[PDB]
Amino acid sequence: RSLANAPIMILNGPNLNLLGQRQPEIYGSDTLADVEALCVKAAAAHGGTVDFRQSNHEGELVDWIHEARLNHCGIVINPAAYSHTSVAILDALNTCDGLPVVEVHISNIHQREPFRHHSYVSQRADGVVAGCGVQGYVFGVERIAALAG
Amino acid sequence: RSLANAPIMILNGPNLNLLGQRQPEIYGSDTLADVEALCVKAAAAHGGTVDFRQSNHEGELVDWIHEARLNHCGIVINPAAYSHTSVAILDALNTCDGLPVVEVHISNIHQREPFRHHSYVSQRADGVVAGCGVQGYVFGVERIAALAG
Amino acid sequence: RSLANAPIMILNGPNLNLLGQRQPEIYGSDTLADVEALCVKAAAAHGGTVDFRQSNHEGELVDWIHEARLNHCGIVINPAAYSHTSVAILDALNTCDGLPVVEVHISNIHQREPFRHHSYVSQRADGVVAGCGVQGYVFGVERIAALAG
Amino acid sequence: RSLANAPIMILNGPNLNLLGQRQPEIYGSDTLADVEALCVKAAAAHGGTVDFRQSNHEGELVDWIHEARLNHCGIVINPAAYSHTSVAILDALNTCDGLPVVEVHISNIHQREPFRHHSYVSQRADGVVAGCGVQGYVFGVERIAALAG
Amino acid sequence: RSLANAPIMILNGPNLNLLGQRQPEIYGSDTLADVEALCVKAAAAHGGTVDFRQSNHEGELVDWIHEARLNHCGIVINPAAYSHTSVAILDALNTCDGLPVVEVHISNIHQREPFRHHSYVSQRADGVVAGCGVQGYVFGVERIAALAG
Amino acid sequence: RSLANAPIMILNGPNLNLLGQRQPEIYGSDTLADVEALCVKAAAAHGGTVDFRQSNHEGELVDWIHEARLNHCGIVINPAAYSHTSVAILDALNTCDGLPVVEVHISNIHQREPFRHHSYVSQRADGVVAGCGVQGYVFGVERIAALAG
Amino acid sequence: RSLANAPIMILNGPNLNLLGQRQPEIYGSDTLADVEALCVKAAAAHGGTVDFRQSNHEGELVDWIHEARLNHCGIVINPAAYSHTSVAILDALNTCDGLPVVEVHISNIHQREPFRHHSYVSQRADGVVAGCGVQGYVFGVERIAALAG
Amino acid sequence: RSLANAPIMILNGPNLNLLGQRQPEIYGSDTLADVEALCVKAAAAHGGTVDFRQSNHEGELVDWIHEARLNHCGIVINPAAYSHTSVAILDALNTCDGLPVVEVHISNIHQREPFRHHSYVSQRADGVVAGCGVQGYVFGVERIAALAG
Amino acid sequence: RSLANAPIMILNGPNLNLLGQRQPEIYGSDTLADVEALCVKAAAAHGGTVDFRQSNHEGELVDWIHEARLNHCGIVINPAAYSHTSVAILDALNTCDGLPVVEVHISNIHQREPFRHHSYVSQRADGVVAGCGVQGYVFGVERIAALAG
Amino acid sequence: RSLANAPIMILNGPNLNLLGQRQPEIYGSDTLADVEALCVKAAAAHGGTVDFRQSNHEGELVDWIHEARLNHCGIVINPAAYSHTSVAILDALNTCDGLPVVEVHISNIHQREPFRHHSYVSQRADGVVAGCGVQGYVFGVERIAALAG
Amino acid sequence: RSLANAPIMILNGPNLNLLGQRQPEIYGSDTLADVEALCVKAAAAHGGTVDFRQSNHEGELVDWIHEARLNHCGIVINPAAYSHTSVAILDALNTCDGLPVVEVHISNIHQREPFRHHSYVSQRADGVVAGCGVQGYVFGVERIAALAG
Amino acid sequence: RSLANAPIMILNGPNLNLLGQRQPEIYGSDTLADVEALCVKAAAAHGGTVDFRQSNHEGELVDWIHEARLNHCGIVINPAAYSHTSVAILDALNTCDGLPVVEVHISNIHQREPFRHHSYVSQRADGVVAGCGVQGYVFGVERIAALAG
Ligand SMILES: O=C(O)[C@]1(O)C=C[C@@H](O)[C@H](O)C1
Ligand SMILES: O=C(O)[C@]1(O)C=C[C@@H](O)[C@H](O)C1
Ligand SMILES: O=C(O)[C@]1(O)C=C[C@@H](O)[C@H](O)C1
């Protein structure tokens, strides 16, 4: 699907419901609603739209990726803690044959604890953006626009 | 229990709802409905029945293992990605004292990525069948029939 | 918050709904209701109350931790299998800046399988009690009382 | 070949000559002759025949695999201890381009010592059956019949 | 032995003679004599007594464990650095067949350097309390009281 | 320094002089000169300029990072093979106290050989962009512009 | 069986046919025939006899172990290189339920290459003698005599 | 010994009897007989002769190395799978004090599976040639000629 | 020195003072005094004498090794837990240039916990006897007698 | 290119300028001039020529590999220390699509320190010759000649 | 403290009482008394004094560190074998907040056995001198004088 | 060469040209020029001279080591980041047969990131001084003076 014909699915993993409420040095002071607005504006500049969601549930994220597979033009995902533990989310992303996928981490996971160094999502994501703050979601949208083009 | 007195529980993990829709070289062209019909027929030859289910949710699979512990004669389980990550499912199976359990993988996990080589489920499953296609489910039913009898 | 102003959240992870129904040599013969009663009693000695819950779902435990963050004076948590697998639970506890957290394991995980030796929760928990039986939940409450103090 | 045109080679590795003479809790009370008879019946149900053999010598197994490559319709193999050590037997099975191969372990190797967890044969075998008892030999014959078919 | 018939042995390993003289953020401001008084009071509520000792010598701790084996109703032990290095103290505790043993760490060793994450003492200790401050020694006395009971 | 007062230094490591001349599936069909033009255009949208360079020499990259430290407003660096081996380039970037640094990889290193999975540069780079193709350089420029502001 | 009733099987692995022909600093200057005569004498002192053998073939050693299992009073084995590689020989010795088995190495394998530090045979052997030269074989016989008694 | 007084022993390990019958991309289209003819021609240019053998049995290869130790001027060996598993063959080559030994792999083992990266044989072989095709056997012969002369 | 001119030092590490009091399946039912008497008899058959000692202190063992270096004809040592942890004792034994040293373990340390598999003493000991019960001390004395001769 | 149309590039890494001035037991007594002459002679026998060079600089070797890519018929490379450290040299060789490359080590790196066992160049080199002395360069030229044919 | 007000504590670990009596190639021919006189002179050149001690006992070293913490101006310590094993000595040095500590090894531990490569002491020592012979004790005194100054 | 006949070569690795310009807590406030003057003064006390150099290029350091080999009386080297990555510098130092070499690190690399813990240079350096500040260079000069004289 193109940007004109279907929304970009923007998915957020566990604990990102609290974004902006603490740890500004690591995660910044923008809320998840602030991130949604950034994505909406970036996508509008390419004539597309976004379907922005957040869950603390691994299986719900799996269900949402299956929905994106059929109805969306691409996926921008910040898997949060599930990046490091979820083979199930990797496997769900592997069912999206041909769909542009971009993984985003607000923080630079490579400077953090060793358990954050590996991401199962990175094995499938086309592109991976880390440590570029909430600006990394706008890079994600930009990349999806380039790949759907 | 016996096969005459209670159904065999057949559980399927995440992403298996899309079985048959892609990657036929790895997973075959049969759907989960097709697999259920194979199971039904196998169990009927021993005078039993099957209770066939699929979920993307780790805790729901744990709930359904607890249900089987009280109401079913055995468990045939393809845990899918949770095979490799879920201690919780292993611990649910460990509560099934004396209940026959057979783990099934459609694909030969030993030939795939190194993160697929280890299964927590194998530490409790009585028997483990891998790489026998969807025919592996039928072996699971036949093994349960032999262990219940 | 103080114990006088808000309850202590007591959280139990997967399979603990079956406590007391098997494996008494490892887990004892007390049920979760019995454990709840021990907690209520220990908190009442400090003029406090408890909010005792159990779930098999990782995401639900995350949600409950966010709830505690806002409404409770501390968290006593037995993460069960999720101790060993959940970065998501650890990141949920990390959002509880300044809240006392005590991790409890009924069994001595250090004598058990190697996959049980590490817990993600222990990186954030203030205190960790293992192998003191259900009495460890009483120690948990006492520790929360001292810390809220 | 088809089952009608050539026998299924069934190969057994070291120490399996003593099957049934000890450790019934691990290996059962059936002898290797008993297993051969189970196999003859199982193949007969599909119109086929078996060529059942046992050796304690790695090189002899290698030679029999080369023989099977030219004269048999498939290989069912219980490599026994050589499962864990023999690159040479893996390399012999790799020469059997297009020939169905099924690996069988009576015992659930995944519950045993860590040196039994890895099998070189599993990298080539189409299907691997473990912990289904001597019934796993019947499953192997069934899977060869399905693949040859 | 019951608490009424014999003292509880409380053993402290190297450098704990300086407890409370520095690093209050990790170890607190209480001295070892303050700890002994906390223990004396906890045991007296159960009609017991304590024999509280500290040594910088691995061998002397072994010697004291052999003494407790014959004359004491349980052992509460903070092995300090020897937790991480002493097979000899583990072996000594192993000789105390049926004697209740609780290991205590004032600090949460799981949040510290990786060499502190493993304890040889935890392989035999019935229960292990870490990161509950000096209050952990009171938990130890209470657990010994319950086990001796 | 601000974008208006000093150029962004854009450094490229070994073998990138051949970009576009082969392996288009991994690295694309754009040349390094094409990449420079993308960078020039992106910086000019923010009123800035770029100083674009390429070297096969680890010690020359070090020199250029020292130059940037004193004269440039930020660094966008694709260290190429030196990402995986160069502690010297990491230490050079560590001397750039307060300067924004963004690391770029054309390819998704996480999907490639395991020796490409670790980057020493990632330990200092504020942000890391991988597998966004040559568009990642534009993301780099955009992130420097945001951080210099 | 007793020593009076049946011989002690003395088995030697690969390359020991050349004992005494080189490397006297590691293996001594006695030949295998000289070792056999030492064994014959030691067994004669206890009213017993020996059946002394050497082979370069793993399978042959397995066959000889199965023979000893039925016809001999114990096994003294120097498995030579197969000590480090042969799961098959370990599994053969495991069939010898109740039979005394002593493993002998002329050299001190623990001072040699790291690949010599682990022996599969040591997992079953009752006793293991290393670095005692050919005199170790005499100790082997004496231990068998004590265990058969 | 010189090439004029004794033959060069050329030894081939398991599965090499099928050389040229499959996998030409890895092993080429020449058969083992073709390889022997190349070696005969190379040795004849130096006035020597070859004694060319192949075996699937580890112990037979050990036996032939002992034979070469007394009767041959050097050994060119392609140990095939035994390269990766056989301490026994390493130990047999170690008995050939002063005899030139060259190890040959047709394929480039370093580009293949990780289990093929290590060779026990390489610890004793004077020279090791890998990935030069069947031409590596000719190199082997030429190096023996230089070492013996 | 010779056996006629100076005693054999027989040293025992921690917890061996309790030998025979428990765990007869692992350590036998003989006491340390019984072992000493065995040693006295074995040395006397060679015209020698023994100096038998036990300590729980690593430093004391070190001191006794220095004493043996100047006054005794050899050392038989069961380092007990210090086998696994004491570089100091290894370093003490390394000062005994030319003195025969035999390490003894009553139990077969290779069948036990992995932390018992490695001994620092085995690096210097001439001979190492394990799993031969208290009879291994007699083998130690005999080996010292042979080496002193 | 063919050998008649373009020279064979022979590259030598760091410290090889001192070849023959020391360590003759490892490296021999031939100088680099001697090696060059060997190469010239071997190439001339195939109607070819050589371009023989040495550098201590990783980046200069990269540059020379790029030159060869365009102007030479193949590369014989002894990367010396860079063999073990240089991803940049491997990636330069990876740009030589279709060009024959042979890696040469004078010494048998497999018998030396463990840090010399792995070579990054071996991942791309067609053939790898180790331990055949300076004669290995002659084999390298011969292999280039066969591959260019 | 200053050098004028208190002596520099110079501590030596196990086996250094025999310094100079053997292994001169590793440890030199100076005795520990010789080293003490070198230290007295080096300290006198700065107007200071030394308190030089040696012990084979880990806990005595800990006791002496605690003494130094209160009464000395610095510590120069050669922990000998305890450098690699003692967390306890590391913890005692950690109690010396603000006191200059320099670790000295006579030998170059980095050229020796891998178990000597790591030192727990080096985590707290300000400076670490290795392989400079007994002259390293003079460097240690010199550094304490500079830090105290 | 003696200190009277030839200068001491003092080599400095990458980034040390910025010494004193930042990170005084780790590296001090002295510049490289200040360090050179300390060296010149230390050497002059022994009647010697220094040749002090710094480079960011690995091959230039190799070249300067080859120069020292022929013209200088020893090497004092702070390899900076190359300590951790350069097998080439180790190999250059290994050509300096009989020349005294002292490695110096201003910082205590053992307290820093794990990648700084290993130094290839330490395998060849006679002595290694770490964490003694710039004074470590003076100890280097003194050690060279003692070894040369
Ligand atoms: O946005 C992130 O930086 C992160 O993805 C979010 C949550 C964490 O759990 C990840 O480690 C990082
Ligand atoms: O059926 C299988 O082969 C598998 O269980 C299904 C999904 C994957 O996640 C498992 O790795 C394999
Ligand atoms: O209470 C416990 O001991 C435990 O937390 C509960 C369940 C298991 O999964 C944990 O490993 C232990």
Ligand SMILES: O=C(O)[C@]1(O)C=C[C@@H](O)[C@H](O)C1
């Ligand atoms: O059938 C089996 O279970 C096994 O294959 C037989 C022998 C053992 O050596 C294997 O580990 C398992």
Ligand SMILES: O=C(O)[C@]1(O)C=C[C@@H](O)[C@H](O)C1
């Ligand atoms: O009490 C503690 O927290 C500890 O046991 C004491 C000293 C340290 O050596 C231990 O690591 C922790």
Ligand SMILES: O=C(O)[C@]1(O)C=C[C@@H](O)[C@H](O)C1
């Ligand atoms: O742009 C890249 O993808 C890369 O940085 C370039 C060259 C390689 O050496 C890196 O691995 C990746």
Ligand SMILES: O=C(O)[C@]1(O)C=C[C@@H](O)[C@H](O)C1
């Ligand atoms: O007797 C020995 O010392 C040994 O068993 C014989 C041959 C080697 O292969 C073993 O490693 C040691």
Ligand SMILES: O=C(O)[C@]1(O)C=C[C@@H](O)[C@H](O)C1
């Ligand atoms: O010739 C070879 O390339 C090889 O030696 C032969 C067979 C394999 O088993 C080796 O791994 C490679």
Ligand SMILES: O=C(O)[C@]1(O)C=C[C@@H](O)[C@H](O)C1
């Ligand atoms: O005699 C033994 O078997 C042992 O040496 C004694 C005590 C233990 O600590 C050792 O592991 C074994």
Ligand SMILES: O=C(O)[C@]1(O)C=C[C@@H](O)[C@H](O)C1
């Ligand atoms: O030719 C060699 O043997 C080598 O390539 C040269 C220098 C060393 O650095 C290599 O390890 C080996």
Ligand SMILES: O=C(O)[C@]1(O)C=C[C@@H](O)[C@H](O)C1
């Ligand atoms: O001074 C030394 O070099 C050493 O500290 C002394 C004894 C050994 O145990 C250490 O490893 C090194």
Ligand SMILES: O=C(O)[C@]1(O)C=C[C@@H](O)[C@H](O)C1
């Ligand atoms: O002087 C030092 O401490 C160091 O050598 C200099 C730079 C770093 O790269 C080293 O790790 C340390």
